[PDB]
């Protein structure tokens with residue numbers, strides 16, 4: 001459980017993410033793939049990318065980065081009450097794309113890193129703690145859906 005203050009901290013930083021969703025999305029994907037290159041293999045449309053030049057030029061890479069942040073945005077704005085949002089996400093990512101909870105932990109790390117990198121003036125220990133809690137809640141709830149779908153996990 002996050003307090004109302006923690007949720008507002010999250011949403012306040014998220015407003016900044018949504019002020020440049022394209023740049024943030026590119027940054028999180030590039031960071032994810034550089035830190036954990038095996039995750040790129042899951043993306044058949046752009047698993048060919050190797051160089052950062054290629055990554056920055058990829059429309060497909062940017063599109064997933066933007067969709068991640070936009071989806072997460074809608075989820076976070078529900079402040080925990082995100083069952084309806086998580087349902088389709090767990091469905092596709094468990095049964096179609098086959099994305100392990102481990103990879104959602106990786107992309108969560110990438111998000112935290114990029115927030116810290118782009119917003120060092122606002123994103124201190126308090127905001128990072130709150131963002132970590134919100135992402136942890138998301139991961140726990142999606143993991144429970146993964147199990148329900150038989151996807152381990």
Ligand code: HEM
Pocket residue numbers: 039040042043044045063064067068069071072088089092093097099103104107
């Ligand atoms: C906060 C975490 C994430 C969110 C909110 C998210 C959201 C989405 C959405 C909305 C789509 C399009 C509709 C759909 O298929 O469900 C999609 C597609 C897809 N996703 Fe994610 N995703 C997340 C994490 C990741 C990760 C970590 C992987 C791979 C490591 C990935 C792999 C894919 C693939 C392969 C597709 C299909 C087409 C494409 O490449 O865009 N997802 N995701």
